[PDB]
Amino acid sequence: SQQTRVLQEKLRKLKEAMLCMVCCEEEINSTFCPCGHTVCCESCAAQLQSCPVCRSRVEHVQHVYLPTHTSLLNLT
Amino acid sequence: SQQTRVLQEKLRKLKEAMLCMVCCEEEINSTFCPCGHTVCCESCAAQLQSCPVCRSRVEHVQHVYLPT
Numbered sequence: 001s002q003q004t005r006v007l008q009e010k011l012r013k014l015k016e017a018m019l020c021m022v023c024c025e026e027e028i029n030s031t032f033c034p035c036g037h038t039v040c041c042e043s044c045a046a047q048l049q050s051c052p053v054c055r056s057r058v059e060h061v062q063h064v065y066l067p068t069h070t071s072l073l074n075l076t
Numbered sequence: 077s078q079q080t081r082v083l084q085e086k087l088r089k090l091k092e093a094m095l096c097m098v099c100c101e102e103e104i105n106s107t108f109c110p111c112g113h114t115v116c117c118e119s120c121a122a123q124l125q126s127c128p129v130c131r132s133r134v135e136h137v138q139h140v141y142l143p144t
């Protein structure tokens with residue numbers, strides 16, 4: 001029904017929000033510290049000097065294990 | 077249709093995975109450091125000395141700003 005299409009759209013949008021803001025391909029699994037923005041995969045987060053969201057200096061990257069992780073890179 | 081019911085269940089399970097594993101009421105927004113388990117809201121995370129997933133000591137809690 002049309003209701004099925006509405007639910008599919010909601011699911012798709014939530015799943016897209018879980019992807020890296022730089023490559024758009026890998027799941028987010030890294031936090032810029034100390035600001036806390038958690039918007040990149042490990043590869044894309046590795047070379048950024050400053051946060052792509054708030055411009056704060058990145059002192060280090062903290063890896064995050066989330067319950068919503070479903071990619072092979074994060075389930076292994 | 078039956079697919080509407082299946083999709084509602086998938087959405088419910090994804091939304092439950094986004095909620096704190098301790099209180100089940102508030103969204104996850106906190107990481108236990110250094111282990112990295114990101115499974116609690118700020119109120120439950122503040123009250124735990126050990127990670128509830130891996131039992132590692134919590135040195136400190138990092139707030140996470142997620143696209144959620």
Ligand SMILES: CCc1noc(C)c1Cn1ccc(C)n1
Nearest residue numbers: 017018028068094103104143144
């Ligand atoms: C990076 C995780 C993420 N980004 O967008 C959504 C939606 C998520 C899923 N998520 C896991 C825990 C929480 C609060 N949201």
Ligand SMILES: [Zn+2]
Nearest residue numbers: 020023041044
């Ligand atoms: Zn990336």
Ligand SMILES: [Zn+2]
Nearest residue numbers: 035037051054
């Ligand atoms: Zn930031």
Ligand SMILES: [Zn+2]
Nearest residue numbers: 096099117120
């Ligand atoms: Zn909680």
Ligand SMILES: [Zn+2]
Nearest residue numbers: 111113127130
């Ligand atoms: Zn842990």
